[PDB]
Design a protein around this ligand. Structure first.
Ligand SMILES: *[C@@H]1O[C@H](CO)[C@@H](O)[C@H](O)[C@H]1NC(C)=O
Ligand SMILES: *[C@@H]1O[C@H](CO)[C@@H](O)[C@H](O)[C@H]1NC(C)=O
Ligand SMILES: *[C@@H]1O[C@H](CO)[C@@H](O)[C@H](O)[C@H]1NC(C)=O
Ligand SMILES: *[C@@H]1O[C@H](CO)[C@@H](O)[C@H](O)[C@H]1NC(C)=O
Ligand SMILES: *[C@@H]1O[C@H](CO)[C@@H](O)[C@H](O)[C@H]1NC(C)=O
Ligand SMILES: [Zn+2]
Lengths: 197, 593
């Protein structure tokens, strides 16, 4: 297995998924250099759970999963096991047994325009909480009241929302690009393996 | 049941997008005054208030007597309050044109000198300069009367139409008048005796003014004495100080008479401007010093956007800019300060003040949109100034290196310091209270407009002890020649603030366990004091300001005691100074006019 895992191109990507409709790419059958990741190095969060940023390039796993999206600065604290908030409750929840790594770098000069990047969205309303790795792209009007509903009327809200992304926002509201790497030990031959094993 | 939490949650998230828009537009106007940016401001304001209207009615549908979460109840009451949404269509844009016009007049007005008629000159930078240095009665007088003649006369008709519309909006919000809307800031709904009804404020002001009044009076007599030495025939030894002879262009702070009134002139200087001049300071260093003081106590430093987006120098671009110092929270961790900071000690302390605002705004950003305010207008200003009280002690000035290091400590220099402090703190109290009281009257209908300035100068003479140099008919609108009056800012804050301060500093000095006089206390390098204060700046308006007070000082209302005790040595000295003097003023003599 000599071809080198395409980790670069999850990160290197003109536009990211909206957290509510977060992407996933399956790294399957290759040698795994976590090195490229530092071609986006200025990192605001680099938190591993189960393995160590200083021990990637030695990880032998059956599979790797790379989930990507755009979030507020504030909300990066929510991409962690056992966390609570809109982004983990209705958009992207992780298992408590998570083995993987959350990676998060600032993306203002790309994802923020002087007139609001309203092409970014998150789910602010849901009847109940997503389970880990659940994903939900409904646009049904949320019904707050016992009463019936109508389009974005009262007691009856449009379910998603859009971050105004503009350069003068303070850092906690700027756009951040997030990549969760999930390391999968299955019972099968391990074919995402690192340079140093 | 509580679909209130949900409605409020959608509201928070739209309203902060829209309020950032409005704030940016207002900023872009305040730092680049053009026709175009004026109109882009009008359009941002239109969208804000069109939005707030629907959200306000939509909220009035949730009964506030079913809400038991006092937090959500404070939010829902804030929102059931339809400020601006009260005025409507023609009258929301009419108001806004009136307001833009007053604003651009105030910050574009130029007055010329009879001596060199080709010398027209602006207030925000230059006429201020004259009013701070000069000691020429006729020079000062032509600048004072020229400002009031050439802008106050331009503002009069505007102030009138402004008062009718602002009052209409207040009545539409179920207030007696606009002055009842502004005093509603001090209204709080908690429990036991943590409530506060608007109509207490006027009592509670008038109580404290009385307790302040003796001290002011003595300071007044003394300042008159020294001013007689520089203007012998223009000032009576028993009457009033002329209005154009004080620290600045109004009688607001007496902090430019220190030179004329320094008790023991042959000693280390409390004013420290000369020092900065030779110490080669600039705007960026004054603010880096404010920043260091706030970190020294344990507060955040300033954001990058604060440095990359604020106005600290007056722009040399050709750009025309409203220069009055203001601290902006544009709702998104987008904090700025708009100030034309010049290298003096006065700007150094005001950088302390306006950064104290920014620090409060950063502090309560954990709170939901509708609760991100001060506990009351005063607290926001007060916080700016508590730090200042410490930033200003000689001991700290010495630590800065701005004083000469050598230890010439003595009551002598403590009297020097207490007087420079009285000139700015105590001096401003009657001017402030009298200004707001005039406005409260004008709003309540008690002054016919055929007697506006008649009741201005009358209250001036009676309450402040200040008389006018030339007579002013109702073609003037002097009161509007101040930023706050013509730029629609509540003014009684600068009263409550001055009292709330010594209540805070005293408490925050007890924490630092500073022994001895409250006026030699300095909370620098005191992380426990910073912690004491931040715990309550983190509340904002989420709790009754009365409890917010008790949380740090142990009072539920204002208390002149710490202020009086801070200035007590100066009271004793000043009293001696006026043993063979009349401690008071009479509105009989005039200065020819
Ligand atoms: C990402 O990789 C592809 C590989 O062909 C390249 O064409 C693209 O330009 C890369 N992105 C950037 C920003 O260079
Ligand atoms: C999402 O997946 C698509 C699949 O074609 C891919 O092209 C795109 O780059 C991904 N976007 C990201 C990085 O979220
Ligand atoms: C100031 O305003 C003008 C017109 O309103 C605008 O075109 C210009 O870009 C502004 N200048 C700046 C941003 O300094
Ligand atoms: C009030 O509601 C807030 C959310 O708006 C919640 O965090 C808090 O716990 C509630 N307090 C109560 C139920 O007393
Ligand atoms: C706070 O500590 C600094 C750092 O040594 C010192 O320069 C300063 O004088 C201290 N502040 C005081 C003594 O008020
Ligand atoms: Zn202020």
């Amino acid at each position: 297995p000599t071809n080198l895992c395409p980790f670069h191109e999850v990160f290197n990507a003109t536009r990211f998924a909206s957290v509510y409709a977060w992407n996933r790419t399956r790294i399957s059958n290759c040698v795994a250099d976590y090195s490229v990741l530092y071609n986006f190095a200025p990192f605001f969060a680099f938190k591993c759970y189960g393995v160590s940023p200083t021990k990637l390039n030695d990880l032998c796993f059956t599979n790797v999963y790379a989930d990507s999206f755009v979030i507020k600065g504030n909300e990066v604290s929510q991409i962690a096991p056992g966390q609570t908030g809109n982004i983990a409750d209705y958009n992207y929840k992780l298992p408590d047994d998570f083995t993987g790594c959350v990676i998060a770098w600032n993306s203002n000069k790309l994802d923020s325009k002087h007139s609001g990047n309203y092409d970014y969205w998150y789910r602010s309303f849901r009847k109940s909480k997503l389970k880990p790795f659940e994903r939900d792209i409904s646009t049904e009007i949320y019904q707050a009241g016992n009463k019936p509903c109508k389009g974005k009327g009262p007691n009856c809200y449009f379910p998603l929302q859009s971050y105004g992304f503009r350069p003068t926002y303070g850092v906690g509201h700027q756009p951040y690009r997030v990549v969760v790497l999930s390391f999968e030990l299955l019972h099968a031959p391990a074919t995402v393996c690192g340079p140093h094993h | 049941e509580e679909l209130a939490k949900t409605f409020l949650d959608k509201f928070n998230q739209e309203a902060e997008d829209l309020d950032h828009q409005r704030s940016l537009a207002a900023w872009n106007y305040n730092t680049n005054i053009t026709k175009e940016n004026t109109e882009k401001m009008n359009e941002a304001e239109a969208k804000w208030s069109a939005f707030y209207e629907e959200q306000s009615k939509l909220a009035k549908d949730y009964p506030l007597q079913e809400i038991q979460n006092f937090t959500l109840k404070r939010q829902l009451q804030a929102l059931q309050q339809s400020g601006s949404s009260a005025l409507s269509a023609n009258k929301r844009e009419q108001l806004n044109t009136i307001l833009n016009t007053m604003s651009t007049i105030y910050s574009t007005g130029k007055v010329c000198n009879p001596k060199k008629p080709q010398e027209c000159l602006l207030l925000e930078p230059g006429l201020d300069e004259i009013m701070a240095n000069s000691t020429d009665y006729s020079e000062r007088l032509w600048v004072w009367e020229g400002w009031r003649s050439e802008v106050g006369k331009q503002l009069r008709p505007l102030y009138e139409e402004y008062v009718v519309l602002k009052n209409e909006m207040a009545r539409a919000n179920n207030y007696e008048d606009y002055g009842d809307y502004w005093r509603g800031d001090y209204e709080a709904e908690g429990a036991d005796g943590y409530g506060y009804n608007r109509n207490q404020l006027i009592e509670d002001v008038e109580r404290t003014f009385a307790e302040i009044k003796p001290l002011y009076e003595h300071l007044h007599a003394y300042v008159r004495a020294k001013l007689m030495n520089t203007y012998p025939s223009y000032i009576s030894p028993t009457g009033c100080l002329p209005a154009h002879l004080l620290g600045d262009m109004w009688g607001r702070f007496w902090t430019n008479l220190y030179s004329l009134t320094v008790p023991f002139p042959e000693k280390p200087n409390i004013d420290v401007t000369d020092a900065m001049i030779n110490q080669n300071w600039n705007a960026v260093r004054i603010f880096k010093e404010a920043e260091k003081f706030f970190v020294s106590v344990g507060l955040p430093n300033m954001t990058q956007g604060f440095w990359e987006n604020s106005m600290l120098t007056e722009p040399t671009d050709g750009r025309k800019v409203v220069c009055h110092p203001t601290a902006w929270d544009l709702q998104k961790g987008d904090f700025r300060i708009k100030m034309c900071t010049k290298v003096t000690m006065d700007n150094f302390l005001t950088a302390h003040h306006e950064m104290g605002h920014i620090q409060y705004d950063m502090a309560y950003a954990m709170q939901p949109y509708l609760l991100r305010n001060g506990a009351n207008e005063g607290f926001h200003e007060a916080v700016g100034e508590i730090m200042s009280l410490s930033a200003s002690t000689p001991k700290h000035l010495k630590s800065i290196g701005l004083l000469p290091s050598d230890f010439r400590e003595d009551n002598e220099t403590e009297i020097n310091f207490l007087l420079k402090q009285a000139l700015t703190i105590v001096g401003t109290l009657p001017f402030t209270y009298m200004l707001e009281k005039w406005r409260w009257m004008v709003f309540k209908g008690e002054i016919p407009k055929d007697q506006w300035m008649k009741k201005w100068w009358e209250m001036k003479r009676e309450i402040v002890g200040v008389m006018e140099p030339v007579p002013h008919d109702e073609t003037y609108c002097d009161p509007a020649a101040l930023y706050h009056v013509s730029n629609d800012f509540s003014f009684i804050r600068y009263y409550t603030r001055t009292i709330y301060q010594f209540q805070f500093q005293e408490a925050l000095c007890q924490a630092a366990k500073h022994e001895g006089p409250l006026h030699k206390c300095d909370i620098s390098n005191s992380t426990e004091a910073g912690q004491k204060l931040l715990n309550m700046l983190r509340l904002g308006k989420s709790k009754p300001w009365t409890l917010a007070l008790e949380n740090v000082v142990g009072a539920r209302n204002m208390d002149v005691r710490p202020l009086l005790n801070y200035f007590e040595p100066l009271f004793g000295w000043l009293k001696d100074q006026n043993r063979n003097s009349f401690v008071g003023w009479n509105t009989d003599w005039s200065p020819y006019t």
